[PDB]
């Protein structure tokens, strides 16, 4: 980047709008229920096991 001052211009403008439409979707309880379903399927899956 560039030091000195300069950056004080659009400082507050970028703070309000960071990215164009941020990917903030709650598809699975704040993106956390899908992590629990993947762990449960590994403990009891289709792995062939003896008796």
């Amino acid at each position: 980047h560039v030091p000195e001052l300069e950056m004080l211009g659009r400082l507050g403008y970028l703070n309000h709008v960071r990215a164009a439409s941020p990917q903030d979707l709650a598809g699975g309880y704040t993106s956390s229920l899908a992590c629990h379903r993947a762990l449960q399927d590994a403990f009891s899956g289709l792995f062939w096991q003896p008796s």
């Binding site: 980047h1 950056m7 659009r10 400082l11 970028l14 703070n15 309000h16 709008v17 960071r18």
Partner: peptide
Amino acid sequence: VSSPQFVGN
């Protein structure tokens, strides 16, 4: 990354 990118969160 710059200074305004880390603050704007």
